[PDB]
Structure 1
Amino acid sequence: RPYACPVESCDRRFSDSSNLTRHIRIHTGQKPFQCRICMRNFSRSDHLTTHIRTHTGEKPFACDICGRKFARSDERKRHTKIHL
């Protein structure tokens, strides 16, 4: 890629200066997005969003076959296969 990981112990390459900025967070341990409910910190805004659904019980993704609801699209994806 056009960007690399400067930490000597690590050797990953990143597409751009924010996938690199994002990745660097693993090393800096920065968790800039906090859950106002349990006060837990997260490295990503998208992961905080879905985390919050564990408190509220919001489940936006329903299975096409049986209708069971899930908080994340990947959980639904993992579930749908059971109908085979």
Structure 2
Amino acid sequence: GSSGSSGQPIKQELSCKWIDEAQLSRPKKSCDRTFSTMHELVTHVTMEHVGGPEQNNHVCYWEECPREGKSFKAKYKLVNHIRVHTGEKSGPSSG
């Protein structure tokens, strides 16, 4: 019974400011990407970057990161700190 055209509000671009290290291209440029959901971004730097348990060396790469490289002692511990950058929520059971 409703009458009227809809028009969802524009979407934002979370983007992934993940400046890898030694990346094929140079100088060390930002990962480069465009997401719409906060879940994607957080899920991006997770596997896309941090990768799964089959990755070699896990470091938090970002344009404005405190560790500016300083890795962690555990794989998860990484994705946990990454959140602070992605802008999403915190990590479950933080050690």
Question: With structure 1 as the length reference, what TM-score do the two structures score?
Answer: 0.33
Instruction: Looking at secondary structure, tell me which structure has more helix per residue.
Output: 1
Instruction: Looking at secondary structure, tell me which structure has more strand per residue.
Output: 1
- Greater C-alpha Rg: 1
Higher relative contact order by CA 8 Å / sep ≥ 6: 1 or 2?
A: 2
